[PDB]
């Protein structure tokens, strides 16, 4: 779809160079290797989770799909009974997942998670802590934001962050709606504004999640 | 588990080879479309749809992503001419040969040049691919025997993303993402892998250039 003017698409010369001039891009290469297309909009969070968990090398489900190889897929993510217990795949397939549910679904695989609702932090701490993470291997960041607030269509979305460009104060979103939008470089204030919104399903603000190996 | 001759993209070295590469135009669009093969037999399908999506070729219209249109492994064979080249059920078992790969891409009105290893040479391959990897609007797919580059094991298909001039290595965007990462393979190893006879076709493997007519 059309990109709002305040967004710099990754599918451009300027978007490519913002990655090349970024000094906070460690997470991009592992995430790029795992980039997937959401099964549907509702599975925006499942696609983002398996990107991060595969990037972490989390020992994955053993199913007949790719046996003997082990890997997270949107098809086998809910093979974990505790994952289904958080929220069933039939339900996620309809309404997606909240930020809290996103954190718990990840924690149900033994992975360590830190959920940061926008209302519980600020933009300065968001920029600092996420930029630090994007310089570090072995951990990742997933964001949950209102697309409308960054000039996109339209509702709440979930997608990992891959890099941060210090010159432009922009974060790279690896948008799993690959049939709809490309990865975009978004200004920190725009992304903060979209995270500082209330998810009607949650009645809580959206935000960002830090994921790492326990 | 990669053999010593291969430099994995999941490495500091593999990342530098991309950052130090002057032949990497195709990586960024291909990265945006990177997909995991449904199964080994579909390595070619995952490869085709990566390239067709990158070229912006108008994609099938199906309920899955409607109104949006995109090439997926599940809908690639919605095209009757595509299915006429070789049926999805047969491709689901035995995959596709180099000739079938080209014809399958051509089934979508896309310009294709099939290059069998027996019809060219390593020098022209290195030369012609390195130049393609420096331009947009076209892409390279290779068909090769994994055994010859130190991998397991049979014939495989995947696109190329970049060429590292200083090491004479090509980066394979391996769509067997659960099995291997993208690898920087030396031109000598890749050619020897392409210069192998596929018993299904009784012809050598090779590479295909893809562009919009
Ligand atoms: Ca690193
Ligand atoms: Ca990180
Ligand atoms: Ca929602
Ligand atoms: Ca370009
Ligand atoms: Ca090219």
Automatic annotation (TrEMBL), chain A:
GO MF annotation list: glutathione gamma-glutamylcysteinyltransferase activity; metal ion binding
Keyword set includes Calcium: yes
Enzyme Commission identifier(s): 2.3.2.15
Residues involved in glutathione binding: 38, 97, 144, 147, 156, 180, 206
Gene Ontology biological-process annotations: phytochelatin biosynthetic process; response to metal ion
Protein residues bound to Ca(2+) 3: 27, 133, 136, 139
Enzyme class: transferase
Gene3D superfamilies given in the database record: Phytochelatin synthase, N-terminal domain
Pfam families (UniProt xref): Phytochelatin
Family matches, as PROSITE patterns: PCS
InterPro entries recorded: Papain-like_cys_pep_sf (IPR038765), PCS-like (IPR040409), PCS_N (IPR007719), PCS_N_sf (IPR038156)
All copies of domain Peptidase C83, residue ranges: 1-214
Residues reported in the UniProt entry to bind Ca(2+) 2: 26, 137
The entry's keywords: Cadmium, Calcium, Metal-binding, Signal, Transferase
UniProt-annotated binding residues for Ca(2+) 1: 13, 16, 26
Lineage: superkingdom: Bacteria
Listed name of the protein: glutathione gamma-glutamylcysteinyltransferase
